[PDB]
Ligand binder design. Structure first.
Ligand SMILES: NS(=O)(=O)c1cc2c(cc1Cl)N[C@H]([C@H]1C[C@H]3C=C[C@@H]1C3)NS2(=O)=O
Ligand SMILES: NS(=O)(=O)c1cc2c(cc1Cl)N[C@H]([C@H]1C[C@H]3C=C[C@@H]1C3)NS2(=O)=O
Ligand SMILES: NS(=O)(=O)c1cc2c(cc1Cl)N[C@H]([C@H]1C[C@H]3C=C[C@@H]1C3)NS2(=O)=O
Ligand SMILES: NS(=O)(=O)c1cc2c(cc1Cl)N[C@H]([C@H]1C[C@H]3C=C[C@@H]1C3)NS2(=O)=O
Ligand SMILES: N[C@@H](CCC(=O)O)C(=O)O
Ligand SMILES: N[C@@H](CCC(=O)O)C(=O)O
Ligand SMILES: N[C@@H](CCC(=O)O)C(=O)O
Ligand SMILES: N[C@@H](CCC(=O)O)C(=O)O
Lengths: 260, 270, 270, 260
């Protein structure tokens, strides 16, 4: 048969090809996650057709309806068979889908515009002059919402009671908003996306401080799927062989369109 | 039924307490892994008796006998139910045991004896003979060796990268042996080798040794790779999913961060 | 039975929350006294309903009428059971109500408008015209006043110390009046008087005002005396001893100092 | 009737004068506490005879026998009627005796031999090279024993399991030990005593850091004594009239036999 793959258009994970208008199939996509999917298919021995989730959402639970949206919803409801994408491994997701071993480690990073007046997240929370937000339906808003530490809890209480809404639809919109905020907005996103953005033109953004915690991206499958252990072994073998590191260097540091 | 929890001797993971001559049971040990086991028991309720692997090894495959030894080996054959220890997740181990999500990140790092400051106006600067793994492999004045029956030895044995392949080729026929039996043995060799030996170990243990007295060693270069420490469990056991969710919950709460901070930095000096 | 806990509107002890127009009960207020009362309830279990005094005065007995007004007055006449607020322990108040062990050390300090920096090779220096209370009594270009119906005013009125007697003698006959009705009124008077008014207030509120924006005021000298804030209780009541024991418990448990640190210094805008 | 006043030989609270061998009665004692007792007797209108507790113990509970020793024991068992002395107001003591309002604020401080390498208590606890102890049968030891904060717990666990016993019989012995330790000993004692010691010859001791907590000294009477309200009123009147301030200035800073 064929394996339907869901993923989200995120750089440098999945990108539309420069000549994607005249291209069909898996040849119209490129990126770290596209290469990961190709290598996973090579190791397992299955034919795959890349698809983009209809709603550009990673996955969360809606307002008191217990409905999964985005890629996780695409998995639990049978619309997809695998999800090679930057999906963070979390408590809530692991209960409804099975995660592979992390293929990329990351944490929570603060993005600002180019003395470092913000520095640590503690100083960011103690000061109400500069604003900060996150990505809706991700693993950042749900991390702050369920946090029990006082500083993260008070950050979340600020962000939820924000006028206007501080959350952004896409991390690209968050990057644009912090770029056009004249140093008045901060974006709380994953460290890998922060590094990729700060390593590209116009190099107007930079990551400040350290990671608030440590998480990872996993490859998700429907609960109780035959693909679980094969894709877990594929991820482990790719990590052992250095293919994951080589792909990360290729899509993060090989180009390096910035002065650093 | 009480749960047998195999664990190895390693700092700051597990340390015998000062007053352990008369103390008996769970209170004998102290460190990181004991607190992790206590938190795991708190999450999913069971009674756990902390034991130590007799062989004192993390685990590997023997030569031509196809027998698993070490902590992983004794977990496979059933004399233990769960390994709450600095056990590294690998492909060969996953094929025989069930690993959980990593609870602490790590990489392969290099330990060398800390050189003396080189005065040349009156400024002291740190200079080192080894900067990366490539120049460590190119040179021959300084010998380098890994830990026997560990994750790093297996990684170098099965590495197809040219530089790592060359390091393994040197290590295989190094006379006398560059391999050690314990992390403490390798650290002592680095100490009383006058800079002629370099130890390849995990970044976590490297940092712990560097931050504690006499702190005459230092870590050079970056991390050769990226791995993690998981909680091991035999195939098909009923404890695997509970400990996986427990590790996820502890990561979410921040308990792991506080444990690492209190057992790695709050007790450091120099 | 639900206990009625009276409190005054004073920052950072009790301040109305931002979303307090749709809120009711013990959720409109936030600060130090609110969670102090929460801790008191959690120690000795009861139901407490926070109230604000109608006349907004701490407490004083008017001469020739012999009627107590303020928090102390309304606690005396049985319309409240416990006062959890910045109420200062005094001799006149102890003869009519039962105080507890102090939970907050305090002193009488001076508030002045912060002067501009002195220009002179390029260093900036802070020069103030008033440092102690003696030179405040000696000078006449800067007026000084206290809070009406407060501990400080009665302290200055009853003081037989020569310098404090002179300060009271000036204060009693001053045209226009140097006394203020609210603490915020005195702070606004200091901020708008352009350095020609010094406000005599407790050190805790003085430091809280100093640490916050727009931070254009500064405290000079040391405290004129040593006093404390106690939780009040009507004479011969059953809540006095449990309140005293709860205050001692919180003091020895580090809760009081942590609350002070996280309500006074953590949110330091300047 | 006469009133028996128990107190401890502590400077500058109670001294034994200098030509005491030819003196009898209350005229052979001097100090801050002697003046305080005289003022209390003047206010209440009673005749008092100063006595020194047989053992120089402030007060605590023995090894699982529920016997009070020292001044507190001298009060609960009826051997004394009032205790004008530097007795710290504590939770355990208040349950057995009546404490007046504090007549002197204070806290727990660190003293060492004359930039300090430890300064704060965090560094004092972290560094095992430097040693520190308290006064036996006091309130600082009971503060550390019953504490729940991590750093105070660590300090207490160190001090109890000390070879040899780090505790001292008298605070004078603690001062002598810290002076004779060549800077290898630290003393955890009350801030007022530390200041008095550091303001005296030979000025070889200094106080570092802040105060770990804040407490006060109270005047203790047996539970349900007729004197409790009069002595509380006397303390309040003395505090309001500045008599306590004057006495502390007289016995702490008026002489000041040190270079400052
Ligand atoms: N350097 S990196 O972020 O691209 C990266 C990060 C990671 C990799 C591999 C790479 Cl290349 N593999 C590990 C996995 C491998 C085995 C050990 C830990 C998990 C299971 N997870 S990780 O520590 O999140
Ligand atoms: N900072 S650290 O090394 O102590 C550390 C390292 C890691 C932590 C948590 C901590 Cl505190 N959790 C992650 C786990 C959380 C979820 C995402 C990846 C795994 C599943 N593994 S990790 O990336 O190996
Ligand atoms: N540092 S502070 O002002 O928040 C503060 C002030 C004080 C505290 C405790 C704290 Cl945390 N406890 C004391 C009390 C405790 C026991 C000893 C004196 C009284 C009874 N009163 S205090 O000296 O007024
Ligand atoms: N400056 S001092 O340490 O000698 C000092 C300390 C204190 C004094 C008086 C003096 Cl002189 N009185 C107060 C008491 C007076 C009234 C207000 C608080 C208690 C009841 N306690 S205190 O704040 O502990
Ligand atoms: N990759 C994240 C989304 C990015 C973010 O939350 O910032 C997730 O899977 O939830
Ligand atoms: N931590 C490693 C062993 C140590 C080493 O190989 O250096 C493991 O779990 O296999
Ligand atoms: N805290 C004082 C009021 C403040 C003041 O007078 O400055 C009291 O209880 O009377
Ligand atoms: N003076 C203290 C004892 C001294 C100390 O513990 O440091 C008391 O009355 O308990």
């Amino acid at each position: 048969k064929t394996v339907v793959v869901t993923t989200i258009l995120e750089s440098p994970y999945v990108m539309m090809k420069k000549n994607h208008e005249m291209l069909e199939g898996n040849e119209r996509y490129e990126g770290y996650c596209v290469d990961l999917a190709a290598e996973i298919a090579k190791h397992c021995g299955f034919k795959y057709k890349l698809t983009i989730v209809g709603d550009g959402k990673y996955g969360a639970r809606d307002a008191d309806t217990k409905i999964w949206n985005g890629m996780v919803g695409e998995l639990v409801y049978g619309k997809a068979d695998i999800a090679i994408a930057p999906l963070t491994i979390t408590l809530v997701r692991e209960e409804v889908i099975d995660f592979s071993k992390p293929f990329m480690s990351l944490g929570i990073s603060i993005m600002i515009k180019k003395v470092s007046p913000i520095e640590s997240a503690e100083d960011l929370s103690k000061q109400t002059e500069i604003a900060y937000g996150t990505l809706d339906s991700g693993s950042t808003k749900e991390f702050f919402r369920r946090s029990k530490i006082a500083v993260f809890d008070k950050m979340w209480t600020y962000m939820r009671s924000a006028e206007p809404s501080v959350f952004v639809r896409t991390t690209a919109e968050g990057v644009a908003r912090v770029r056009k905020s004249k140093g008045k907005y901060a974006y709380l996103l994953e460290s890998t996306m922060n590094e990729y953005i700060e390593q590209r033109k116009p190099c107007d953004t930079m990551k400040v401080g350290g990671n608030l915690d440590s998480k990872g991206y996993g490859i998700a499958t429907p609960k109780g799927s035959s693909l679980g252990t094969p894709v877990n072994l594929a991820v482990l073998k790719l990590s052992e062989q250095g293919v994951l590191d080589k792909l990360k260097n290729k899509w993060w540091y090989d180009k390096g369109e910035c002065g650093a």
